[model samples]
Target: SMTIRFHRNDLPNLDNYQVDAVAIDTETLGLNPHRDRLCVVQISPGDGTADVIQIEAGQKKAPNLVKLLKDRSITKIFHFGRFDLAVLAHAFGTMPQPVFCTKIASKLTRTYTDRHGLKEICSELLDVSISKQSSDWAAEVLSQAQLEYAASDVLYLHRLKAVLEQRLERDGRTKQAEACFKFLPTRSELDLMGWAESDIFAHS
Candidate 1:
């Protein structure tokens, strides 16, 4: 049985974590601040359990959640974090600081392939084959399948992170990865600033 805890509105004060980093990912309604909003924030402490927090419509509060997200002392691990960083920043009015992107790490390390998706990374690095889908996260109650899928998003990130970190080390790209991770939040803010689709440096 998978251990998944569901919370309404926001997360409580969490003192215990399996590592200095917590894996986080969000499920959104429309993937932005205007056309849509955040629905779920999933967090894993690397202890084989997950905390899924459902955000009510039009909510931007949750002092504890915001506090945790903004804490630069604790590194936040994410897969494809640009989107989540945008969603969390616009919704919570704060950016989750000092983040790590497993996807970025994969790109820096796993140069032989182009597939950097969570499913691909998880499958290749951790040997976990996962099948998944999406649905209306703002629904009053989430079905068991939905919960499990959300849980799966964050479940293997820690393990994936471990492998990717080692690969990054071997490839001598850890510092470069860190540079990209540090800039990801700004990259995401660019998305929120009406430039979501445009490549700024391009001649277009």
Candidate 2:
């Protein structure tokens, strides 16, 4: 339940990060560039200062690191991972390990009720309010402030994940956390259920 604070001024080389090209999978999940699963950048802390992809759309695939993340087991830290997970699964048929979500972890830790938002979590833990208001992402290039704001998301997450991971160990529900992972539901199950309905021959 304890929170950490980070100042924007403390971040270094924030602007160099770029929003990589959007990936479109026309054959599989039918993802398109026009859709909202917008991918962006965030730094990987505690790993010698690296960047991790942050997705703004329903899913996130760091333009550069989606393949890398898939190749290995990386812990994904998110506030409410259901939608994020859905988007990611829709993007790549992969999920992260030791999924550390602030909302669920907070409830497990008893640090907060279920009423917390990312901004509240960050403000309470990091003493900063992350703006949810839309930004001019279409600018010829991202401004320094925009880059800092974006980086702050994953930047502070490094310090914040430590606290949550500790609680998962202490709370004795690490496996429960593991079991909570989201995946594509069985399509056959849905098809079977659909077959049972009346007028099965009618196609949409």
Candidate 3:
């Protein structure tokens, strides 16, 4: 029960967005040029159903999505959030702050494995058997089956986050998750600024 809002004013030229709703495969996700890639982003307002957003390279810059991430009012929840954060930072100039990953939280609580897929975690933790066919994620266009599968990955995250948070509270693992979040960055990234001072500017 969540809602999603996009900058309608910003995306005026792309009129028939419904046609653009496509499934994002590894190639689309791994590459930069969005024209060759398409994604149906799930947006939820923490109230009602989720909506799919059609984002493309031909439409706007990556930074637009970054603005959405930084909006403090909403807490963006994802599974295995670190990789996404690293890749998405290209749009935002910095990583998304105040983000939560249920998968990492699950790991901290010892409820799951580090290599567990999002669907597996969701099924085991939330009792929701998410059907994300590899064929769909690997395909270009999203059939009805693919869209439903793709949408579920994000749609259930909000509810899953709530449950995980309560578990953290009940089990006194909030601090552990917090520590995990703090340390999730890479060694290079964690010391980026410090390295610049010590290694890059040792003589200067």
Candidate 4:
């Protein structure tokens, strides 16, 4: 099975998955990480395998997920990781490390295109179709449609990274991307700490 749904407080360990990078995405109540809550976390290790974890209300910890996310050896790939990383840090008290954001990659490499969302990136680059999204992420029993949507979010990330990375290399922005990626956790932390829309680096 490509997708595995679980709700264990102590999520399963994925250290031995033998993958250098794993794609991840999260569903939350809304965009504001401070007010909204993280509901579902979807992960894929470039194997068409989606691990969808439904976080319980005020879940104290997901041991395995936290460990994997915190592990620097495995790069946690995402799209718009600013929100996802911040929410994970807020919910679990640990920020995921060594991140690669497809959105960032697209912005750096695909400058000619304004479509950088997961939907557009997958459609244009991989010719892949994304599943319909859902709103009831915090529900007790998630519908099959919701689960499929959760799974779709992480599935194509690895492939997208590969292609986008090549473009980065060609455009001589791979190093720039790396610098941005390294700063992501700090960026997320700033957002969580009330600088979400304020550019402290501004000249104003």
Candidate 2 residue 174 C-alpha distance from true site, Å? 3.0
Per residue, candidate 3 scores C-alpha lDDT tens digits across 1-204 of 223333321333322222211111111344432223334455444443445444544433544444555554445566766545544443325655556777787776655455567777677777887666635233444566545554565666766777878889988999888776655444224333344124433567
Model 3 — TM-score against the truth? 0.63
TM-score of each: 0.94, 0.54, 0.63, 0.94
Q: After aligning candidate 1 to the native by TM-score, how far in Å is the CA of 132 from where it should be? A: 1.4
Q: Which stretches of candidate 3 lie over 4 Å from their true place?
A: 1-27, 31-40, 58-65, 92-94, 111-115, 135-141, 183-204
Model 1 global lDDT (CA atoms, 0 to 1): 0.86
- lDDT for each candidate structure: 0.86, 0.45, 0.51, 0.86
Clashing pairs in model 2, backbone N/Cα/C closer than 3 A: 3-125, 4-125, 4-126, 44-50
- Worst lDDT 10-window in candidate 3: 18-27
104, model 1: CA deviation in Å?
1.1
> Which lDDT tens digits does candidate 4 get at residues 94-144?
989999999999999888888888999899899987855538678888877
Q: By TM-score, is 2 or 3 better?
A: 3
The TM-score of candidate 4 is 0.94
Question: RMSD of each candidate?
Answer: 1.5, 10.4, 8.2, 1.6
Per-residue CA lDDT of model 1 for 85-168, tens digit only, reads: 999998988878889899889889988999999988878888898776847888899888888899888888889889988999
Tens-digit lDDT track of model 2 for 142-201:
555655555445545555556766778888876765554332122212222343233434
Q: Residue 64 error for model 2, in Å?
A: 4.7
